[PDB]
Structure formats: C-alpha cells, structure tokens
C-alpha cells in the first residue's frame, strides 16, 4: 500500500528514452498479461534440458522455444520461456534474470507472445 509495493525487477517498460518500438497499448496490453519471457544472451551450446531446470525453480514451465539462425539453423544465442501463470513468470524475472547460466549472465525481458517465425535471427 506504500513504496514497498514496488517491483523494479518486474516493472514492465524499461523506460528507454528512445523513439518507436512500443507506443500503443494494443500491444503493451499483452505484455503485462504475458507468461512468456524473452531470454537473451545464452551460450551457443546451452541446451533445452538446462534451461528447463533453472526456470523451473521459479515455477512450472510450459514450453521453451530455442532460438535459431535463419541461415545456419542452430543456437543463435537466445530463446523464449512460457510459464503457465504470470505468478511464476514474475519470479524468474525477479530472481533468475541477471543470474548465471552456463557460466554467463543471462538477461530476461517481457515478451508479448511467441508467434511462428520469431525463432529465427
């Protein structure tokens, strides 16, 4: 009910004083009601099995879509993690974002949703 209500880590805007890549809530609407996080900067040899273990400590996962190369068709350096409810999603965003995976700092962000063709660099 005060300033302890704050959730800097789950805050949904990363207020980039930049021009246009998120201005209308026709999208934004989906962001704050999403359960799928965009995980970027993974190790080229990071496996699906590994991500599963890590992101499950913050709640049950639905599906992990490994990032591929539109050309070479292999680990491009990212992936998408869809949880079953926002609850678990916020946690991973609260406690997993910024931690290490395969000996490196992984940065996670909120994603409107996974569409086919989004797994190609």
């Amino acid at each position: 009910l005060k300033a302890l209500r704050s959730d800097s880590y789950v805050e949904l805007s990363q207020y980039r004083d930049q021009h246009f890549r998120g201005d209308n809530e026709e999208q934004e609407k989906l962001l704050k009601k999403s359960c799928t996080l965009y995980v970027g900067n993974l190790s080229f040899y990071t496996t699906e099995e590994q991500i599963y273990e890590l992101f499950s400590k913050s709640g049950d996962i639905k599906k992990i879509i490994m990032g591929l190369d539109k050309m070479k068709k292999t680990a491009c350096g990212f992936c998408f993690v869809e949880y079953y409810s926002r609850a678990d999603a916020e946690n991973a965003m609260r406690y997993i974002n910024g931690t290490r995976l395969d000996d490196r700092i992984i940065r996670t962000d909120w994603d409107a949703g996974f569409k086919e063709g989004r797994q190609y660099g």
Binding site: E48, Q50, T99
Partner: protein, 733 residues
C-alpha cells in the same frame, strides 16, 4: 490536487529511511509539518501512520515516537489515532491476519513508553489476552497466539511496564506460566530442523520466548538493542497526556477462525562461531529475538526486489554492535528451512545471498562458506525436507560461482556408507549440478577420489536396439516401427504394425514407448512432440490403470539413467492425459523404484504430480466461482467437474498414504521379528517423507479428517507411524 497526499506518504517513510542528519531532527521536523497539516486535513495523516504501524515493523520505535511528538502537540490527534488502531486490529483478527495483528499490539505497547497510552490501560487488555487460555473447547493455536502477542511485546514495553501492575503482571505471569507448562508439544518433532540437542537445541517458539522474557525480568526488564527515538524526547514527551484503551474482549473462536501454526526456532549460531568480532546475543537473550524478528521483517517487505533488500539488510539499525553477517545468514537459512514451508520462494534466497556477497565482498563470503561446512557437518540428524532444500540451494549457488568448492574438506564422506546422509548429500548435489550444465563438466571440477559419487551418464536404454538378444518377443515389431517413425509414419500406420503383436497388452506397449523414446531421445523437444503426435496411440494402448502403470515402467527402464528426463516426461504425460495421478502414485511406490526410493528426483515427481492436481482443483473452483457471478448449463458442467476434480484429489492422498503405511508397518514388524535397528537410513527417509506430505499439502488434507482419523490412521497402527498423523494434527490444534 493530491500532490499533498503523495508528498506526505513520502515524508512519512523518508524519516525511517537513512539520512544525512539525526533521526531526532527528522522526527522533530516531521512533527510541525504534519501538525501544520492537521487542520489542513487530518484524515490522510491518520490512515498513513496506521499503515506504517502494521506494514513497517522493522521501523517500529521510530514511528511510535513520531506519533508521540504529535500527541505532545495535539492531544485530540492521539485520541483519534488510537481510536483507529484498535478498530484496525479489530478487522485484522476477523480476516485472520494474526501475523500482522501482532505488529499492532507491539506498536500500541511501545506507545506506552511514548506517553500516549496509559501504562495500566495496556495491561488491562493484556490480561484479556491471557484470559483466553481459560476458554473452553478451543484450539490451542488460538491460545498460543494471544500469549505470543503478549510476551513478544514485553521486550519493548516491559521496562517501564513493570513500574506497575507488577501486582497483576505477576498474576498474568503465573497464569501464562501454568498454561505454558500445560501445553501439548506433539508438533515439535515434525517441525524441528535437526533432532540433535547438540550443539544447538531446536526449541519451541513459545518455550523459547519464555526463556527470553525470564532473562529480561531478572535483568530488571533492561535490554540493549531496541532503539528508543524518544530518549532525547523525554523533555517534550512528559507534559504529554496519555490516553485510555477501552475494554477489549478478544473475538470469540469460530469455525471461521484460522490461527498461525506453531513454530520451532532455528538455531545454528552462537558467539563462539565468530570468535573475533562483536559478541552475538545468547540464544535465550532477547536481543537475538529482536534482530531476528526484525531481519525476517526486512525481507518480509523488500523481498520482491533482491537488490534493495540487500542494502536494507546490511544497513540495519543495530543499537549495540552485533555481527550482522552471521545474523543475516542465520535468518535466511532460518526462513529457507522453516518447516513446513518458507515464507517466500526457495530461489529467492539463493539469489539474495548472491546479492549480499556482491554488496559485502570483504565479509559475507567467508561466513557463508563457514555456514555451509557447519550445515554439512550436522547433516546426520537433519530432517530430509530441509536436506532437499539444502541440496537445491548449494548446487544453484555453485552454478553462479564457477562450481568452485574445496571438496577435499568433505573428504570424510568417501569413507562412509553410501546410504548415509553426508555422502548422499554430495551425491544428490552433483547430480543436480549436472542438470545445470552437463555430466562432463562435473567430472573436471571434483577431486579424483570423489569420482565415485559422481553422476551416472544420461544414456538411453534401448532394449531392442543393438541388442543381440533377439530372443526377446516383439523384437521385429520394434525394428519395423523403428523404420516406420523414421519414414514419417502416422498413427494408423503405427497401429497396423502393432496389430501384429502377441500377449491391455504388456508387449504392445513396451515395443511402442521404447521405440519412440529412442528416436526422440536426443532432446526434450523431440520426446514431447513425439508423445504429442502419436498421442492417440498412447491413449489407446494405456486405457487402463495397469497399462498407464506399465508405460511408466518401460519409460523408467529406458531413462533410469536420466532423471530430469523421467521427470519432464511424467509431467507432460499427465498434462496431456497420457497417464493420471493415481498411476504415478502406485508407480512411485513400486518395486521397480525401490533402489532409488530415497533419491530426490523420485519425490520431486510425486510432488509435481500433486501440485498439478492441486492447481487443477483450484482452477475449476475459480471457473465455477466466476460462472455463478453471471446458457449457464456451464455451471452444471463445471459443478459436476469440481466433484470429479476433488474425488480424484482425495483418492490421490488416500493412495499415497495407504501405500505409505504398507511399506512402513512392513519395516516396523521386520526389525521387531529379527530384533534389528529401526533407525535405518531408509527408514529415516521413508518416514520423514510421509511427514513431508503432511507438511507441504496440509491445507488440503485437513479436508479428509473424517477419513484419515477414523480409517487410515487408527490405534492398531504402529505408534511410530500414527505419531506423524497426530503430529500433523498439532498444527491446527
């Protein structure tokens, strides 16, 4: 135009928060500010100070003082504040927010040393708080609390609270002394972290607090840690004129009242652990209770933000210099191990600690490594539930720190029985680290002599593969299916091959699962979509509970060298209804899994299976709760679905237990006929696990009292078992 409502809420908080000036000035300054703003509308500054009174305990004394200075400037304010407080407290109890309610009581109490409430006025109600222990046919939990709410305030309000009613606070003492000794302690064993009375006894909360009040009484109610902002305000505070708390009669127990479950104090530190540096309060001293109560409260507030939480913790008010690092850590593990469940989510602690290490590189590290060692060393008497959490924590912790550990310090386990805790630990630990990386990486980080306890490799077991054992039935069916899958065969094209199989069909299943898991063994992605594509085949083969069991049997026979896989499959298998909860139950309690029955993953699954069942019920409860709030033959459909959603949920626990008693009484009568020791490493796990079920899913279970009590756990049942049920009952009694 509420710019004034925003600035206020800010100025209110800004005082408790650190500053570049004395806390006194900030309070004094804030005084005229708020006073100057009373005519210029009160209502806000009222509903504001009340909030800080509940949601900001760690800052207690500071805000009681603020309210003081206001009293000694506006009598009529304190009178409408205290009028608010009780009313708030009157709403808290009805909603059953007893954890919160104790914060008020602790506030009001302090107000007494702030010249706001009459010294006696508070004992008046405190008498009523103790007087509930005289009420008939009411859960001990209710009694324990009101006594808690009292005793706990006393480290604050008691110093000056004994200059009076010491005639009654000798009565209320003896009245609380009698009830304290006349209280059943059935719970303690099911709530202890360790069972070892050495080196640190795990004492009941109320049985420990009483020992902290006594040390206070005999010290003339003199403490040395709670900061009194009103020490330099006595001069302005005296002429202030106190108020009277009208008669308070504690809301009567109703079949709609929920009271905090009993708790057992976590103790793993004393002043000797840290020799050089400040002296840690004693286990029975009040200071300790104070710091711990406040630290638990610091994370209670800023848990959502690990980064800030660190600072708020490292920069604690600590009147007399204490060894914060050990207190911080001790409070974290205290929460992480809090039986039944921790106050927050396990992963949170892992990350927080990491943050702490970043904030204070020079101190926190060394401690943690010292705490790990200790936790390990005491492992033997540790309760399994906590162990898992321990195993879960460290591995994760290691994964963020290049898996760097001086293992040779635990070289003592290599010379112990594999079924023994210490070695079992390192095992389950490494096993988990692998999943956080890959089996090879682990072999390079451990010493040569530890290679033995290293993880098995994730090798798939294809019964009908390069096996020259052609003497096995349906050998060709699998080979034909093999090529079938590779050529992009469909369900009907798979049924065809399967129709030509000899014998629900034990063999027809075996040759299916085995074959599909082998070509989909590469990744988790394949195995799933595979289960999905030929889903119709699966659902056709396993249409019986015997078949649903078998699937899992073969599957295990295939992936018994890859748990994470076994886990992920069972999960997705039930979510797509290829297998149900009941089956996974009889499977977890099957003879094929006896050699692994004590390994983590096992129960992990069992719980996954349960949660998914638990979530299912709740969902259909909300879909029906939303439906009614409005063609509607949907409600009929849902209502009927809830019935079935629970029925299966009941059966589940009914099974997990019936089977649990089966494998227990089986061991109890065995060590009785042979005369062998009951305390076997396997008995430890098995029995405590049965306890873990009662502990994590207590909320739900209470719903089958009519069944558990009179049917599944009756007299005839061996006392070692029944014990845990009667223990479980101690939580809500």
């Amino acid at each position: 135009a509420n710019e004034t409502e925003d600035h206020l809420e800010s100025l209110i908080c800004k005082v408790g928060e650190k500053s570049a000036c004395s806390l006194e000035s900030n309070l004094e300054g804030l005084a005229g500010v708020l006073e100057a703003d009373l005519p210029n509308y009160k209502s806000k500054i009222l509903r504001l100070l009340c909030t800080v009174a509940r949601l900001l305990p760690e800052k207690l004394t500071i805000y009681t003082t603020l309210v003081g200075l206001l009293n000694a400037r506006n009598y009529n304010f304190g009178g409408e504040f205290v009028e608010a407080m009780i009313r708030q407290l009157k709403e808290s109890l009805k909603a059953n927010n007893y954890n919160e309610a104790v914060y008020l009581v602790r506030f009001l109490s302090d107000l007494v040393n702030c010249h706001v409430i009459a010294a006696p006025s508070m004992v008046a109600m405190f008498e009523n708080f103790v007087s509930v222990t005289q009420e008939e046919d009411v859960p001990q939990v209710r009694r324990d609390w009101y006594v808690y709410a009292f005793l706990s305030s006393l480290p604050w309000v008691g110093k000056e609270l004994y200059e009076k009613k010491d005639a009654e606070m000798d009565r209320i003492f003896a009245n609380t002394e009698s009830y304290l000794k006349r209280r059943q302690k059935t719970h303690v064993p099911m709530l202890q972290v360790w069972t070892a009375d050495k080196p640190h006894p795990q004492e009941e909360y109320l049985d420990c607090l009483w020992a902290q009040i006594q040390k206070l009484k005999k010290d003339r109610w003199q403490e040395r840690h709670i900061l009194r902002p009103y020490l330099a305000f006595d001069s302005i505070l005296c002429e202030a004129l106190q108020h009277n708390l009208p008669p308070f009669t504690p809301p009567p127990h109703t079949e709609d009242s929920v009271y905090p479950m009993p708790r057992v104090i976590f103790r793993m530190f004393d002043y000797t652990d840290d020799p050089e540096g400040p002296v840690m309060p004693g286990s029975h001293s009040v200071e300790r209770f104070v710091i711990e109560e406040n630290l638990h409260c610091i994370i209670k507030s800023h848990w959502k933000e690990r980064k800030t939480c660190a600072a708020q913790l490292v920069s604690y008010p600590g009147k007399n210099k204490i060894p914060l690092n050990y207190h911080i850590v001790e409070v974290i593990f205290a929460e992480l191990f809090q039986l039944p469940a921790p106050p927050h989510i396990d992963v949170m602690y892992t990350t927080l600690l990491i943050e702490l290490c970043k904030l204070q590189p020079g101190s926190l590290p060394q401690v943690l490594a010292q705490a790990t060692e200790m936790l390990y060393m005491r492992l033997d008497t540790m309760n399994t539930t906590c162990v898992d959490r321990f195993i879960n924590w460290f591995s994760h912790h290691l994964s963020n720190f290049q898996f760097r550990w001086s293992w040779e310090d635990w070289s003592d386990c290599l010379s112990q029985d594999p079924e023994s805790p210490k070695p079992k630990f390192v095992r389950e630990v490494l096993e988990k680290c692998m999943r956080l990386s890959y089996h090879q990486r682990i072999l390079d980080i451990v010493p040569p002599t530890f290679s033995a306890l290293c993880p098995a490799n994730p090798t798939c077991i294809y019964k009908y593969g390069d096996e020259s054992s052609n003497s096995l039935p349906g050998h060709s069916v699998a080979l034909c299916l093999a090529v079938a899958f590779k050529s992009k065969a469909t369900n009907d094209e798979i049924f065809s091959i399967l129709k030509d199989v000899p014998n629900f069909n034990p063999l027809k299943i075996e040759v299916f699962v085995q074959t599909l898991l082998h070509l989909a063994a590469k990744s988790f992605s394949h195995s799933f979509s595979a289960l999905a594509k030929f889903h119709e085949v699966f659902k056709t083969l396993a249409e019986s509970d015997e078949g649903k069991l078998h699937v899992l049997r073969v599957m295990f026979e295939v992936w018994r060298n890859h748990p994470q896989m076994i886990a992920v499959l069972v999960d997705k298998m039930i979510r797509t209804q290829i297998v149900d909860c009941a089956a996974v139950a009889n499977w977890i309690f099957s003879s094929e899994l006896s050699r692994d029955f004590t390994r983590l993953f096992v129960w992990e699954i069992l719980h996954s299976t349960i949660r998914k069942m638990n979530k299912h019920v709740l969902k259909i409860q909300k879909e029906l709760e939303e439906a009614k709030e409005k063609l509607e033959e949907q409600i009929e459909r849902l209502q009927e679905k809830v019935e079935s959603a629970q029925s299966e949920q009941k059966n589940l626990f009914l099974v997990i237990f019936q089977r649990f008693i089966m494998i227990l009484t089986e061991h109890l009568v065995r060590c009785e006929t042979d005369g062998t020791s009951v305390l076997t490493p396997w008995y430890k796990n098995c029995i405590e696990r049965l306890q873990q079920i009662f502990l994590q899913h207590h909320q739900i279970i209470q719903q089958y009292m009519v069944t558990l009590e009179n049917l599944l756990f009756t007299a005839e049942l061996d006392p070692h078992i029944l014990a845990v049920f009667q223990q479980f009952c101690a939580l809500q009694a």
